[PDB]
Subunit: 115 residues, 4 copies
Amino acid sequence: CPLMVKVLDAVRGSPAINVAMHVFRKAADDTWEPFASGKTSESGELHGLTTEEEFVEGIYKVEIDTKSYWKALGISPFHEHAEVVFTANDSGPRRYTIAALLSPYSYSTTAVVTN
Amino acid sequence: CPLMVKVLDAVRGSPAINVAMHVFRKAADDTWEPFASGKTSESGELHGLTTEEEFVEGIYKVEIDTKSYWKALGISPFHEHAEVVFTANDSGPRRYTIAALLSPYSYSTTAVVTN
Amino acid sequence: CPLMVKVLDAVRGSPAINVAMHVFRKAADDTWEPFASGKTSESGELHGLTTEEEFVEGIYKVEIDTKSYWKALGISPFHEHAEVVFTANDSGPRRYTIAALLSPYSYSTTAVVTN
Amino acid sequence: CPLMVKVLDAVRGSPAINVAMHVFRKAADDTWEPFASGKTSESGELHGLTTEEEFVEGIYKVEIDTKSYWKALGISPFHEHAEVVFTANDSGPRRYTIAALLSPYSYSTTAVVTN
Ligand SMILES: O=C1C[C@H](c2ccc(O)c(Cl)c2)Oc2cc(O)cc(O)c21
Ligand SMILES: O=C1C[C@H](c2ccc(O)c(Cl)c2)Oc2cc(O)cc(O)c21
Ligand SMILES: [Ca+2]
Ligand SMILES: [Ca+2]
Ligand SMILES: [Ca+2]
Ligand SMILES: [Ca+2]
């Protein structure tokens, strides 16, 4: 699993379940092409987005639909979504875990990159 | 000053100085048109991006060039930039302060919305 | 003002107002003696805790009563308080701003140390 | 495993390995009694601190020795340690995951509480 996303809810102290996200990859013409999508599980994790072979060097964007998450909980949040944009595999294949910690008016995101 | 951006550096414990950013407003064709830009001051702040009359309801994106900041410090970063996408809404007088706390592999962003 | 504390609320997108805090200085017998205290203003800030002459090198602890804050808002919190423990060091003129961003089950704290 | 701690390094984008921490439990006389200790593994996690039977209701403090971690990497950080203080099991047994994201001048901590 070369790309995994974990989302946590800082209001409830729980995984953020059923959070939709879309991954894009920058094309040679500088447009964002769709790459993968899914939603987080009961553990707040989304696995299986891509494979080692398909996850080539490039600039990737993970768009996490945080607004829909908060609205379903009755909360009108500040952000439309959380965006994570990064260059991947520029020094060879790596495994990426992208984590997001969500509050209505704030989020934090980190990356753990392993060889 | 209806919109201010403040950027902090979590490695140095300092304002993040000379950080470039661009602000975009979402157009009707779902594209991002440039709206304002600047670089942070010695206090890590960027003021004067817009005026009350110009800052109408809509979806705005603040793109903070964090990669160039870490590059100038000789530190290898994860993100291409930090993106803050939000809806500005008219409900009484509202001033928006977007704050971002930067680390090489993580960032946090919050919004302080006041009257 | 060599020491200022700023507290923000990530659920409401606002300064965290009327948050009590106590500052302690570590004594030679490894106990915490009270040094200063106050409550945050309507801007979420607490100034005037100490003076340049009094704020000598040592280990300091800022205990922020986050539990009482969330209780007053009717929101069940995780932490009893938020603790910030640090060494103040003389290396040129130094002003310390401790910032804390509060959510019910999470907090973030940073230090901005300037001249 | 009713109590687990995970520590991440926001400068390197990696688990924070070999981070020492000590857990204390508040006694009836309001002193902090030692409860458990250990260090994080290669995955940045510390498991096996306690058991369901031993982890009774009470106020617990997790003291994470972040200063020693940064110093071994050549960095002089701001904080002496990261402290996480919380009431546990007040509504019956729960499982607690305490996470800390570390930077030299900042840290974030969250809790995931499961039934
Ligand atoms: O608005 C903020 C929030 C910001 C902040 C952002 C993310 C974080 O995780 C933390 Cl701890 C703190 O700190 C600040 C420092 C400051 O001098 C003035 C400010 O307005 C802020
Ligand atoms: O990987 C992480 C990191 C995440 C996190 C994200 C942003 C943050 O600011 C903080 Cl503190 C923590 O917390 C976690 C909680 C958990 O149960 C299992 C995990 O793997 C993580
Ligand atoms: Ca390459
Ligand atoms: Ca309206
Ligand atoms: Ca000295
Ligand atoms: Ca009870």
